[PDB]
Write a protein that binds this ligand. Sequence first.
Ligand SMILES: NCCc1ccc(O)c(O)c1
Ligand SMILES: [Fe+3]
Length: 308
Amino acid sequence: TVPWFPRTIQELDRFANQILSYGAELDADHPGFKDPVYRARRKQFADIAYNYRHGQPIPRVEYMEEEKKTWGTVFKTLKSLYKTHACYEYNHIFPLLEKYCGFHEDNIPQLEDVSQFLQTCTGFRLRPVAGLLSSRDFLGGLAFRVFHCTQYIRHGSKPMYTPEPDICHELLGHVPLFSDRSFAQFSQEIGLASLGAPDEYIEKLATIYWFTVEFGLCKQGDSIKAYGAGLLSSFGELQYCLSEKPKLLPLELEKTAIQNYTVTEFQPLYYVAESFNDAKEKVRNFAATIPRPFSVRYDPYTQRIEVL
Ligand SMILES: NCCc1ccc(O)c(O)c1
Ligand SMILES: [Fe+3]
């Protein structure tokens, strides 16, 4: 039968009891695996996420000097590339994040301040997430303009590398785009298409998500710029994606939806969007082909999904 999905924004609280409990930091391969302090610090951030409930302010955390040093290294190194590689929407908002959210080399911004700023721009809000959510729950949150965000940071032994999302990736990669109204509507359309969709389509939407929100390129004037969070938080791939090496294809969902990708090396190919409004339209058309015995609409006044 139709798989369950949240109908009010508060029902998102039901996701905490549905994450992968044995996370990446438990693998022998993780940069912080033999470090017991790092291991305890991760447990500490996971307990904060676990106990969090919709509507509460996100807890503030005092980051250690070692964590701030890792943040500073990542921040200074990536910052040099945005003016020439990042899409206009990213560069337009960055100064405001520096002024009101504390985006600076010496300070890790607190999620509550960032979430309030996003709320004022487009109504997006953040909630801390323990570990790995299923694609279904992760995309479902977007229908409500809710982004599940990590609050921990990568291990300091390898500042320019992370095998998973961490706070540098969320703040430098995702957050700036969620400040833009058109990108916000586009992300939300992906989430709405996902509600009650059969598993095999959830995987298609997760693949579309990967080639847009995480690794998307966008047309701007007669140029091409990065807007994908995974590119914007990766020093090496951001430079590589705008060089002559990768193959570039126009965003076509029927095709993008089944494309294979790897998470371990630079992407051999990227899809280019004409604009976020156009990508939004393509998602809405694609959602029409998903076999669901109903239709959905979000009502921002009461924060509930209406099932038609
Ligand atoms: N679901 C696979 C892991 C994942 C999901 C969403 C993201 O934004 C990200 O950076 C990584
Ligand atoms: Fe991400």
